[PDB]
Predict the structure of Bromodomain-containing protein 4.
Amino acid sequence: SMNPPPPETSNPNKPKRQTNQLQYLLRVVLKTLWKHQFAWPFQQPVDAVKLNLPDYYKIIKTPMDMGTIKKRLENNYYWNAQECIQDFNTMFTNCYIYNKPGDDIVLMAEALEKLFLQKINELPTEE
Ligand SMILES: COc1ccc(S(=O)(=O)N2CCCCCC2)cc1NC(=O)c1[nH]c(C)c2c1CCCCC2=O
């Protein structure tokens, strides 16, 4: 079983803008999680081929990861902050669907998610 193509990170047909909320999402929220001890399972799409996980994309139909989110922000793929927040939520949801209580990755996801929520609770004012 092959990996699916990774999520689109650029769309030359979508209008683009910079906002303070998107600045905060890339340079505060994403950066805080990206530099964290537990970031590494979440920095790129799950490679079901190299890791020999042929059921991963049978179970996870909306994959998402912080490498994709980072590239989406850097390519101005998001217009609304909620599009980016939704991607982080999807990434965490996938981890809790595929993995079980007691798995190390679940503990890593919980710690990253706590930090994500703390940072998003300080999202700046909308324009
Ligand atoms: C044993 O699992 C790994 C071992 C090493 C690395 S790695 O060293 O980072 N690396 C180099 C080797 C080839 C893959 C590309 C990066 C990653 C992973 N695995 C993840 O990054 C990852 N993430 C999630 C969200 C998952 C998983 C897989 C396990 C649990 C299921 C899951 O939900």
